[PDB]
């Protein structure tokens, strides 16, 4: 009867009890330990967008993706990342990862200029660079014919394909980069289907660029073909990602450190190693985790 343990009921609070068991885990380390052996993917001074597009300012296997909240390094060229939040949701659960030259810069684009598709808004070692995973396609000496490259998924895995749509500030810019004044874009997959046209307008100098680039993405199921029809403004893919999805994987946005420790349960506040069914540490959890509660103790 020696134990001073206390339980609570609907009617009266703080009642001393002999035999009683806890349910809540309040204790944790400030460390972001590797989940079940496998190390996480930390993107310091970079966000998912920058890493996935191939921003020059910025590993295959990981347990979870870490991002510094302070990290703003993503779209070097100004624009709008379409369904970016929806892309994070899809990239939450990711085991394997193969980056491959879907449409290699060498062969794939022969009736177009691939080498002049670089800007100062996207620098790397002082040089005018661009995103490594996608080519900015411009006219091959005053002649931009209708391009129509198509990829057929042979990887067996879900293939993530990213591409851009350049919106020139002046009408003259469209006529100097693609020449075709009434240019269109089309991306056809079994699940994805959208037509694009450039929104020619002078916008504020964001990263000292008057024009903008919208960044679009889709997944291609194995066996399915993704077609790319364009007469201008398309920023074609170079590298795509054949990925194998995991279950217990997510995205942590925390400034907490990461150490060589192992953990069964991981939260942005820190790792947890408990047999308890409930936890009051943090609502975001990765792996076999005790369901979050706001309670003091249970």
């Amino acid at each position: 009867n020696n134990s001073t343990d206390t339980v609570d009921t609907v009617l009266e609070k703080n009642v001393t009890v002999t035999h009683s068991v806890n349910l809540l885990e309040d204790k944790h380390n400030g460390k972001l330990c590797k989940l079940r052996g496998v190390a996480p993917l930390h993107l310091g001074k970079c966000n998912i967008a920058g890493w996935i597009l191939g921003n020059p300012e910025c590993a295959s296997s990981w347990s979870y993706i870490v991002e510094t909240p302070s990290s703003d390094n993503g779209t070097c060229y100004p624009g709008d990342f379409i369904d970016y939040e929806e892309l994070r949701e899809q990239l939450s659960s990711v085991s394997s990862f193969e980056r491959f030259e879907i449409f290699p810069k060498t062969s794939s684009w022969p009736n177009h200029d691939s080498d002049k598709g670089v800007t100062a808004a996207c620098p790397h070692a002082g040089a005018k660079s661009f995103y490594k995973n996608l080519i900015w396609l411009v006219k091959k000496g005053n002649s931009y014919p209708k391009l129509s490259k198509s990829y057929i998924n042979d990887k067996g895995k879900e293939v993530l394909v990213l591409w851009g749509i350049h919106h020139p500030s002046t009408s003259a810019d469209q006529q100097s980069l693609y020449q075709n004044a009434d240019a269109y874009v089309f991306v056809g997959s079994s699940r994805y289907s959208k037509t694009f046209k450039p929104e020619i307008a002078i916008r504020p100098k964001v990263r000292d660029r008057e024009g903008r680039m919208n960044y679009y993405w889709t997944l291609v199921e194995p066996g399915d073909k993704i077609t790319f029809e364009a007469t201008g403004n398309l920023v074609v893919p170079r590298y795509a990602f054949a990925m194998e999805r995991n279950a217990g994987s997510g995205i942590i946005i925390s400034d907490t450190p990461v150490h060589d420790c192992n953990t069964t349960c991981q939260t942005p506040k820190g790792a947890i190693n408990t047999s308890l069914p409930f936890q009051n540490i943090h609502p975001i959890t990765i792996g076999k985790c005790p369901k979050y509660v706001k309670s003091t103790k249970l």
Partner: antibody
Amino acid sequence: EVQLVQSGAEVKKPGESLTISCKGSGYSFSSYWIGWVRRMPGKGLEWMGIINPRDSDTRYSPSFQGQVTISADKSISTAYLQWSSLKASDTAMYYCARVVADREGFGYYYGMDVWGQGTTVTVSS
Amino acid sequence: EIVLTQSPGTLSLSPGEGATLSCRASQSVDSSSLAWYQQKPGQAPRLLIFAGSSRATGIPDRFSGKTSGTDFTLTISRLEPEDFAVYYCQQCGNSPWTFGQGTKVEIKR
């Protein structure tokens, strides 16, 4: 407003040193390239050169390279057309102009929009 | 020098007629490098068409730019009394930038 205010009329005897201004007003002077166009009495328009005021780099025409010197002061937002030694052939009408180019930084030049009033230079003994 | 030779020498038109001005280059130049200017007597030049076909900042619908091969055209639908001036073409491709000969548009009488 978006206007270029050039230097006043100048009359000097040959051999002398003359420098004519061109003041960019109501815009980011350093963003746009500034050129220079000569017009001789009873002749056509001759292009002299261009300066990017932020880069302070000059690209002279073969007919004007070495002879005349194109200066630029981004701080005062003023372009210059400095003369080493004046020739009787330098008796002309001189214009400066804001050059139109691509917003992607590629080097495509579309012509020149904002023009100066015109500096009247007389070079006679 | 990429010699620009304007045709005709002078255009004699009645205020209301349609003007068509040619500018044939020595060698082939980029369309986006070509521009059309209007100079009035005792006045600084004005930009009408820049980048070959793009209409300048505050220019009426009547003024239009065309290019195919080496021809290069400045077309006006209605010639207003204000339109009667000297018209120049200019290339901005191979340095030095050269200006055309210049066609004067005079009131036909």
